[PDB]
């Protein structure tokens, strides 16, 4: 597999999420994580996580809101990014 798999919310507070995924086989330099309201009215927020991790914390969310969370793998030795995996989660 070249794409991160099995993206999921492992734990949640009313305003934050701890997300987990399974690393691809291809070596990753960093994961690119974006999150925003599933509607899309506002711009998405984005941050990077080291390629050696497969979890992350998203904080500062609004409660009772539908969010789309998306993970991209940046390959260390190859140009470009994996295909995205994404999930929806309602705080």
């Amino acid at each position: 597999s070249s794409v991160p798999t099995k993206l999921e919310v492992v734990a949640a507070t009313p305003t934050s999420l701890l997300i987990s995924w399974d690393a691809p086989a291809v070596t990753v330099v960093f994961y690119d994580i974006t999150y925003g309201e599933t509607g899309g009215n506002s711009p998405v927020q984005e941050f990077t996580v080291p390629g050696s991790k497969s979890t992350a914390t998203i904080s500062g969310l609004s409660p009772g809101v539908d969010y789309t969370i998306t993970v991209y793998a940046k390959y260390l030795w190859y140009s470009g990014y994996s295909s995205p995996i994404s999930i929806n989660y309602r705080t």
Partner: protein, 168 residues
């Protein structure tokens, strides 16, 4: 004659291929046609030592193979390339240093920080920032332009000198 395995890494489009072509390109027939895709060989004289440079570029995704992934971490020295008009490319450099060290399980990996496209007017990364980052890593920082050829040779030759200092 000593060989040096050199790997060029960094974000998309910062000019990793351009710097490698500019270092190899001459007016002869290309002295080698390596069969490993995105590899490049060239002989040079650094500080007197006549050295052969095997240079691995960041390959396209069509070249993925599990063995290529393994082969790339055996590189002896790495150019961390960002583009001075691309802030994210500079902000992600630390990931490259961190993960290269990790996959090599080594605490001292010869490395040079390279700030490219220095001919462009649209600078978004300050020389001082790059110098400060390179200092914190204890590695050299070289400002380059693949268009004007500024610093291209200094970048790769400094990386060779760092590999030497590593092996003592």
């Amino acid at each position: 004659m000593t060989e040096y395995k050199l790997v060029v890494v960094g974000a998309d489009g910062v000019g990793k291929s351009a710097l490698t072509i500019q270092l190899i390109q001459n007016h002869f027939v290309d002295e080698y046609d390596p069969t490993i895709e995105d590899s490049y060989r060239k002989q040079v004289v650094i500080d007197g030592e006549t050295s052969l440079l095997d240079i691995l570029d960041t390959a396209g995704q069509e070249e993925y193979s599990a063995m290529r992934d393994q082969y790339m971490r055996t590189g002896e020295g790495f150019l961390l390339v960002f583009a001075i008009n691309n802030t994210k490319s500079f902000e992600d450099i630390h990931h490259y240093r961190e993960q290269i060290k990790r996959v090599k399980d080594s605490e001292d990996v010869p490395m040079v920080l390279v700030g490219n496209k220095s001919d462009l007017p649209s600078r978004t990364v300050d020389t001082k920032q790059a110098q400060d980052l390179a200092r914190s890593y204890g590695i050299p920082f070289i400002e380059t332009s693949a268009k004007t050829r500024q610093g291209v040779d200094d970048a790769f030759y400094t990386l060779v000198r760092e590999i030497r200092k590593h092996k003592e």
